[PDB]
Paper text:
The coronavirus S-protein is responsible for both host receptor binding and fusion of the viral and host cell membranes. Its ectodomain is composed of the N-terminal S1 region that harbors the receptor binding domain (RBD) and the C-terminal S2 region that mediates membrane fusion. To address these questions and to gain further insight into how the 229E S-protein mediates membrane fusion, we determined the X-ray crystal structures of three additional RBD (Classes III, IV and V) complexes with hAPN, as well as the cryo-EM structure of the ectodomain of the S-protein trimer. We find that an invariant set of core interactions defines the interaction with hAPN across all the RBD classes characterized.
To provide further insight into how the 229E S-protein mediates receptor binding and ultimately membrane fusion, we determined the structure of its ectodomain by single-particle cryo-EM analysis. To facilitate expression and structure determination, the ectodomain (residues 17–1113) was produced as a fusion protein with a C-terminal fibritin foldon trimerization motif. In addition, a dual-proline mutation (Thr871Pro/Ile872Pro) was introduced to stabilize the pre-fusion form as previously described. Since refinement with C1 symmetry did not reveal particle classes lacking three-fold symmetry, C3 symmetry was imposed in the final cryo-EM map and during 3D refinement. This led to a final map with a resolution of 3.1 Å. In our cryo-EM structure, domain B is in the down conformation in all three monomers of the trimer and we see no evidence of molecules with domain B in the up conformation. A unique feature of our 229E S-protein trimer is the existence of a large opening that separates the monomers at the C-terminal end of the S2 subunit in the helical core and CD regions. The most pronounced effect of the monomer rotations is a sliding of one monomer over another in the helical core region of the trimer interface. This leads to the exposure of a significant proportion of the CH, HR1821-852 and UH surfaces to solvent, an outcome undoubtedly facilitated by the hydrophilic interfaces between them. The interfaces between the monomers of the trimer in the helical core region are hydrophilic in nature and this has presumably facilitated the exposure of these helices to solvent.
Numbering used by the authors:
A (entry chain B): 858 to 908
B (entry chain A): 37 to 148, 163 to 565, 575 to 758, 768 to 1033
C (entry chain C): 455 to 504
D (entry chain B): 606 to 656
E (entry chain B): 707 to 756
F (entry chain C): 253 to 303
Write the structure that this text describes.
Amino acid sequence: ISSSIQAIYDRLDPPQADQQVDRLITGRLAALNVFVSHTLTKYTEVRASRQ
Amino acid sequence: ENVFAVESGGYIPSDFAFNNWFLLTNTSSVVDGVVRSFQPLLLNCLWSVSGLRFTTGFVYFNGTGRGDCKGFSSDVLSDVIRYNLNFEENLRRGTILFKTSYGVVVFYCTNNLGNFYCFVNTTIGTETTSAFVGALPKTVREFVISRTGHFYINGYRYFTLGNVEAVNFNVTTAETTDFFTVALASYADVLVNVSQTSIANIIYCNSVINRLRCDQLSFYVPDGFYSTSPIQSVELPVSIVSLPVYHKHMFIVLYVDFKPQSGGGKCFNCYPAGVNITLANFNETKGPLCVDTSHFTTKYVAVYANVGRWSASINTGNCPFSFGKVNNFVKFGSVCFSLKDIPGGCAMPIVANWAYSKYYTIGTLYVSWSDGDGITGVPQPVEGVSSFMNVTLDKCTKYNIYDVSGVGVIRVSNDTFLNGITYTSTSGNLLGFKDVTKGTIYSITPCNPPDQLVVYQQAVVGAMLSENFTSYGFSNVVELPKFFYASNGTYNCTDAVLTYSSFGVCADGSIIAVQSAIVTANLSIPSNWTISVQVEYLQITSTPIVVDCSTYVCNGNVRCVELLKQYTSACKTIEDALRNSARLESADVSEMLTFDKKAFTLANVSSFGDYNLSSVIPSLPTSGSRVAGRSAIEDILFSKIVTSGLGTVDADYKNCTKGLSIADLACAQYYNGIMVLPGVADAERMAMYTGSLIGGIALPFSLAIQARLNYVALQTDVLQENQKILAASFNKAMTNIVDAFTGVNDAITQTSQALQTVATALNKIQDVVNQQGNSLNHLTSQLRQNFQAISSSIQAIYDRLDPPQADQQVDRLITGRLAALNVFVSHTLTKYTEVRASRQLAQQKVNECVKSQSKRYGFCGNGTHIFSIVNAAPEGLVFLHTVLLPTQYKDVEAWSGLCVDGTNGYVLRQPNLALYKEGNYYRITSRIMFEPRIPTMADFVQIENCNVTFVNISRSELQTIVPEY
Amino acid sequence: SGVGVIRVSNDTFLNGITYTSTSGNLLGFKDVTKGTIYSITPCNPPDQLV
Amino acid sequence: VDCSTYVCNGNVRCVELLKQYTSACKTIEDALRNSARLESADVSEMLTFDK
Amino acid sequence: TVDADYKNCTKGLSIADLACAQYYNGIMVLPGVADAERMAMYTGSLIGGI
Amino acid sequence: IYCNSVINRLRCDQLSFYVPDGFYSTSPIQSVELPVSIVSLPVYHKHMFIV
Ligand SMILES: *[C@@H]1O[C@H](CO)[C@@H](O[C@@H]2O[C@H](CO)[C@@H](O[C@@H]3O[C@H](CO[C@H]4O[C@H](CO)[C@@H](O)[C@H](O[C@H]5O[C@H](CO)[C@@H](O)[C@H](O)[C@@H]5O)[C@@H]4O)[C@@H](O)[C@H](O[C@H]4O[C@H](CO)[C@@H](O)[C@H](O)[C@@H]4O[C@H]4O[C@H](CO)[C@@H](O)[C@H](O)[C@@H]4O)[C@@H]3O)[C@H](O)[C@H]2NC(C)=O)[C@H](O)[C@H]1NC(C)=O
Ligand SMILES: *[C@@H]1O[C@H](CO)[C@@H](O[C@@H]2O[C@H](CO)[C@@H](O[C@@H]3O[C@H](CO)[C@@H](O)[C@H](O)[C@@H]3O)[C@H](O)[C@H]2NC(C)=O)[C@H](O)[C@H]1NC(C)=O
Ligand SMILES: *[C@@H]1O[C@H](CO)[C@@H](O[C@@H]2O[C@H](CO)[C@@H](O)[C@H](O)[C@H]2NC(C)=O)[C@H](O)[C@H]1NC(C)=O
Ligand SMILES: *[C@@H]1O[C@H](CO)[C@@H](O[C@@H]2O[C@H](CO)[C@@H](O)[C@H](O)[C@H]2NC(C)=O)[C@H](O)[C@H]1NC(C)=O
Ligand SMILES: *[C@@H]1O[C@H](CO)[C@@H](O[C@@H]2O[C@H](CO)[C@@H](O)[C@H](O)[C@H]2NC(C)=O)[C@H](O)[C@H]1NC(C)=O
Ligand SMILES: *[C@@H]1O[C@H](CO)[C@@H](O)[C@H](O)[C@H]1NC(C)=O
Ligand SMILES: *[C@@H]1O[C@H](CO)[C@@H](O)[C@H](O)[C@H]1NC(C)=O
Ligand SMILES: *[C@@H]1O[C@H](CO)[C@@H](O)[C@H](O)[C@H]1NC(C)=O
Ligand SMILES: *[C@@H]1O[C@H](CO)[C@@H](O)[C@H](O)[C@H]1NC(C)=O
Ligand SMILES: *[C@@H]1O[C@H](CO)[C@@H](O)[C@H](O)[C@H]1NC(C)=O
Ligand SMILES: *[C@@H]1O[C@H](CO)[C@@H](O)[C@H](O)[C@H]1NC(C)=O
Ligand SMILES: *[C@@H]1O[C@H](CO)[C@@H](O)[C@H](O)[C@H]1NC(C)=O
Ligand SMILES: *[C@@H]1O[C@H](CO)[C@@H](O)[C@H](O)[C@H]1NC(C)=O
Ligand SMILES: *[C@@H]1O[C@H](CO)[C@@H](O)[C@H](O)[C@H]1NC(C)=O
Ligand SMILES: *[C@@H]1O[C@H](CO)[C@@H](O)[C@H](O)[C@H]1NC(C)=O
Ligand SMILES: *[C@@H]1O[C@H](CO)[C@@H](O)[C@H](O)[C@H]1NC(C)=O
Ligand SMILES: *[C@@H]1O[C@H](CO)[C@@H](O)[C@H](O)[C@H]1NC(C)=O
Ligand SMILES: *[C@@H]1O[C@H](CO)[C@@H](O)[C@H](O)[C@H]1NC(C)=O
């Protein structure tokens, strides 16, 4: 429904709200896992550059 | 008796066996694992009753009527009563009675198909509606009643009774030896270690450190820096801001009335009598009731009594909001309600239910809307043209500001901006807003932004804060260039146990920053030499993991596998990335682990005399089935480190379908298609490699070890005093580090240089084990997650649905589970790249330190190096380095210049060193050190002069300097 | 629900009626009337081919 | 990254729901922490001094 | 930004700059491992090596 | 090729006419139809047909 997680809880009964929020949790954990790959990649490239 | 005194505050003492106390469940009790849950394990009172006599009593969850409590007490409203039974007549006679808010309920069991069945006598008005409820589980050892009427027997919820005031349990006891304990308990938040489906040990997530254990599912937390946000204030003011608007106002009031059936002539639970429902002002001759006004409010009115176990409610049904919840500033372009169906609108069922066990849509509310705005739902009435702004400055607040909502601290701010009315980050969070009527700018700070905690030896030793006051109960704060730091630090330490960029933290939690032969001189030199053994660990490998992608994704379901084929090469690319990287680890480690039979037979205590290397040489093959076995320090190390509850890598598949017992983690993850390959570095091949490499120093053996001293010290250190006493000193140092691995022994500061390295090594090894466990846990646990489908159980989808519709549900699970694999592949490949660097460092450490004698400083221990020992460790090699250190540190004087035949003078161009004379010898050494090592040609230049600051010598006495001048 | 081989097993456990992995798969169950414990093995777990 | 704060924006109901994502945050944030510790070690080793 | 400084991010006297705004999202840039002082020290020593 | 033999199934499931030397995971094909087993807690068997 929204990116504003508080707005989901403002709108909905908790059983239905939690299944909306599971979409945001699953998305945001994927967004972190992408950023971790960017970060680790850059450290490996930089480790070669430092050597 | 096996019963205990409750600790003050209500906790269960950490040594307790949990002998017949069960982890409660609504379903699916875990076999082995670490789990975090709310459980009734915080105890408000506990006592026992014993079968010499019997007493019958009614115990109220408010604590009334309880027994004589042990160790501690509290008078709060309990959530649960636990009865724990020592004895064998179980529930097969006697009764349990519940004073329910409307009457007495009796539970009892009977066998009058020779086994026992259980029945509940709900009694109302003195008519008894006796009901069956289940078979009795065979050996009742615990049963538990919640205040909300859940009844758990042996840790499973057999049924529910609805709210209870008081419980009585009534028994006649065959012996004086019979007893049961009783406990009144409250739901508390705990981390639990479960083995063979029984509680082994627990911790409570109450203290700052235990919360950091719980939130990482680990009983041990490795040293490091951990992010945490402190728990937020339990209830919050509300603040509201909006643009002024004409306050035309409306109430949507919904009234629900219904009656029970009664007297059994119409059966009390069977369908609601007397149902009446209305909206106010729903004159349906006008059509659906519509919100004409700018602000509206929703009210639900319960006209019915809560007679018996009857309840009623609105539910969201299929709407993107709930009735009631639309009062929270939800906005619409138009919204309308009806009790007759309306087109395109969702419907909210007006549900009555009895006992949460029979449910009736006594009506429904039909609701329809346009998105947009001009209609807002609000908590309470409003009037006129003027509109309030309601704000709670400087306190954490729940806000709805210009139709944006969240939680934070609202504060008036020094900025002025012409533009806009709300200000936001890239992430769309509110950062501030403008009071449009007044031109003031307010800023939003999230209350409890993340702090960061420094953990060292499983206490929080300090914290890093965005503000200048002592969170976490620390004593003092200091400013630093980019944050505040808070600690119980005395600022009187110099050795850092952790480092974080430019900053070192010492063991007190206190924080710090980190970084002559020319002269007739007085300089300070060790007249005695002492040796220390220093310990370092490098990971050599990680146990390769290969996943059968088809089995992981589809759980073996045949329809799923046919659908998975459409994901062209998706499995192929995942599983081949894991296979290729496993093949490279196997090649590299197998290349590294050499052997040499000659050196291996020499690698023995017989070959070392005074030097008690007995603890580090590989053991004889007492089994005969091997060339070698683990050393004493290897067995201590492998046994001292707890294999993770989150996922094993010591897998063995040859029992996983013989099936004589319920699967351990190794088989349980193999069922999910995850295979740990056999370790590339077998304990035999490690003992062979390591033994050969220790034997490489025997290639007279103590005299060769003494020759390694001679690179520091020629003349003195071959004297029997040094030969014997340095060997005795080595044996003492070895005795200290083998004790330190064997068990916790306190380090004084002098031993702490060595003993901190042992503590550092064990924390690094336990961290490697725990990271491997977590990586594997995150993969297996994702199978439990349903990716916006009906269920994670792929067979259940096919049980429910026609194949065309089922396959589109399953595509959600396939897409999710292929993403979960792709994440695990990145974890795995990352760890192999980190380990490849660690392995490369380790094999050059083997060359320089272990085989050679390293000429570097600080590369093998903080001290002057003589030799190294290696041993196996978890996924690892561990190193012992032996190093020589100043003692009896005092003046030994040093000379600029030497005067030759009393007539010619010698001046020296070797500033890296110090030059000194003793016992008819002259010796040149690093500026503060006691190396009896001789000077050389072209260190000295010669002049037709002498000075009184020189020493005096003939051209034959020059032989003490060199034979060459 | 699922597919697998159900087998009577040597274990005894007091707790629960169903037993599960971290992945939420059934690993076994208890016949509540009789106190026997049964274990579930998935038929055709992955082998590996050279 | 504080994975809990990134995913849930500090909302308390969300954090209780996020606990069900067993070790998902733990593996993200420990990968970032371990790699940060290695960068700090390597650069701190490289940047010598001689008065 | 990566030139972060957290010691103003809750004093709150002005609306957050990017450094605080991303810290609100739980993203922390650690202090640079190579401080301008430690760089000047390393570099100076290494130029002095001639 | 026809995905009938053990090796040809391993070719087909990798979309390759050539399979490189190595170790390949496979689960053998399952029995074509299955008995049904049912377990449930005892309950009062009041019964109805929706025809
Ligand atoms: C099998 O399934 C059943 C359901 O079929 C599960 O039953 C539920 O279990 C959960 C816990 O897992 C229960 O929640 C806890 O209930 C405690 C008692 O709550 C009742 O009384 C309080 C007032 O005393 C009411 O507020 C509750 O709810 C009502 O009020 C809210 C207000 O928002 C309404 O929304 C509801 O509609 C109700 O009208 C209940 O009537 C309660 O104390 C407990 O609170 C702690 O935990 C929450 C988070 O879960 C914290 O926010 C809160 O701050 C409390 O924790 C802190 O406070 C304690 C105080 O001593 C301190 O020690 C610490 O500081 C601590 O951090 C929580 O709400 C739920 O009520 C229950 N439902 C039913 C219907 O029974 C079973 O548990 C499950 N079994 C297993 C084994 O999994
Ligand atoms: C979680 O709970 C289980 C069960 O208590 C713990 O496993 C047990 O751990 C103990 C040591 O804490 C092991 O005991 C040792 O076993 C060896 C080998 O038999 C023996 O030589 C030692 O003298 C000692 O007895 C025990 O074997 C092990 N039991 C099982 C069934 O695994 C586990 O360690 C707990 N985890 C945590 C983090 O608390
Ligand atoms: C616990 O709840 C019980 C039941 O409501 C309370 O006991 C009753 O209290 C009323 C008012 O004093 C009396 O009329 C009843 O006769 C009491 N019954 C019994 C058996 O005592 C009790 O007072 C409550 N206790 C606490 C600590 O709140
Ligand atoms: C629970 O209620 C049932 C039904 O009222 C009780 O069983 C009846 O008890 C009376 C008196 O002994 C007998 O006349 C009936 O023939 C019984 N009916 C059946 C079906 O057995 C039962 O005794 C109550 N449970 C108790 C008191 O433990
Ligand atoms: C830092 O010092 C403070 C005292 O200045 C310690 O505070 C105690 O904490 C324990 C555990 O919560 C309490 O039982 C005590 O009552 C507290 N004492 C006071 C005076 O507040 C704190 O534990 C110390 N922390 C560390 C890690 O050293
Ligand atoms: C208590 O249990 C005994 C079992 O012998 C039974 O005879 C008695 O009627 C019970 N009394 C109550 C009040 O449940
Ligand atoms: C119930 O079990 C007891 C146990 O000895 C037995 O004596 C009695 O006959 C049984 N009653 C029945 C089957 O009705
Ligand atoms: C239904 O309930 C409402 C609210 O109490 C009331 O106005 C109305 O008279 C009741 N009866 C009918 C037939 O609507
Ligand atoms: C602000 O909201 C609170 C919440 O109860 C209320 O008590 C107070 O009257 C409100 N102030 C104004 C100006 O409406
Ligand atoms: C505060 O506001 C005034 C006027 O906007 C400005 O001169 C001053 O520099 C500001 N100081 C800070 C710290 O924002
Ligand atoms: C921070 O706290 C300390 C100790 O109370 C105090 O001396 C100092 O003035 C405070 N302010 C700053 C900016 O350091
Ligand atoms: C502070 O450290 C110095 C040097 O180690 C020591 O002499 C002194 O005793 C220490 N003081 C305390 C009490 O920590
Ligand atoms: C060590 O050497 C001695 C003889 O030098 C020999 O008797 C003994 O068996 C050897 N021990 C081992 C385990 O190699
Ligand atoms: C070597 O040290 C170990 C320490 O446990 C001891 O058991 C052994 O007897 C010692 N052997 C010699 C030759 O000193
Ligand atoms: C495998 O089963 C056999 C049965 O003979 C047993 O002896 C062995 O200990 C079991 N091993 C494991 C790791 O389950
Ligand atoms: C190295 O050892 C010396 C002498 O024990 C000690 O003063 C110094 O602080 C140590 N430095 C490190 C980095 O361990
Ligand atoms: C089989 O069960 C009995 C009793 O539970 C136990 O003594 C025995 O050790 C078990 N053996 C195995 C291999 O599970
Ligand atoms: C932080 O606030 C202080 C207020 O005294 C100000 O002097 C300083 O310039 C600010 N620094 C940053 C980076 O915001």
